From a paper:
Specifically, RanBP3 enhances the rate of NES export by increasing the affinity of CRM1 for RanGTP, thereby stabilizing the ternary CRM1/Ran/cargo complex in the nucleus.
We therefore pursued the structure of the RBD in its unbound form. Crystal forms 1 and 2 contain two and four molecules per asymmetric unit, respectively, and aligning these structures reveals variations in the N- and C-terminal residues and in several loops, reflecting the inherent flexibility of these regions. In contrast, the β5β6 loop, whose functional role is evoked below, is highly uniform in structure, suggesting a comparatively rigid element. The strands define a continuous sheet with simple up-down topology, forming an imperfect β barrel that juxtaposes strands 4 and 6 and extrudes strand 5. The C-terminal helix caps the barrel, packing against strands 1, 2, 5 and 6.
Author numbering: 330 to 411, 414 to 453
The structure:
């Protein structure tokens, strides 16, 4: 793996019961790339650990069907796969980090989508 970016941020999960964001808390978020040594094909993931205690609170692989929306100047709404699992989460950060994260995710997802439509959608 190669680290693409690292940023301080705050993570929220969407709670279907209360129909509201539930704050998980702050941590260091990394976007990591891993290129296949056979196809050069790219897989990427978002990994986040709490500050201080370094406990894992996010480890989500990027997929073509993942949707990313800039929910505000300082936040990004993301979907994920995989029950009782949380489907939607929110990353809040500085305006600058949010912009960088959005751009990085956008291009990776766009690449994945291009690949899927060529491979699986004729």
């Amino acid at each position: 793996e190669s680290n693409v970016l690292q940023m301080q941020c705050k993570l929220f999960v969407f709670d279907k019961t209360s129909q509201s964001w539930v704050a998980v808390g702050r941590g260091l978020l990394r976007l990591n790339d891993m290129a296949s040594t056979d196809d050069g094909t790219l897989q990427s993931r978002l990994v986040m650990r709490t500050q201080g205690s370094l406990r894992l609170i996010l480890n989500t692989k990027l997929w073509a069907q993942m949707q990313i929306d800039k929910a505000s100047e300082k936040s990004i709404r993301i979907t994920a796969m995989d029950d009782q699992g949380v489907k939607v989460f929110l990353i809040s950060a500085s305006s600058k980090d949010t912009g960088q994260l959005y751009a990085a995710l956008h291009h990776r997802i766009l690449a994945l989508r291009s690949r899927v439509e060529q491979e699986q959608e004729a």
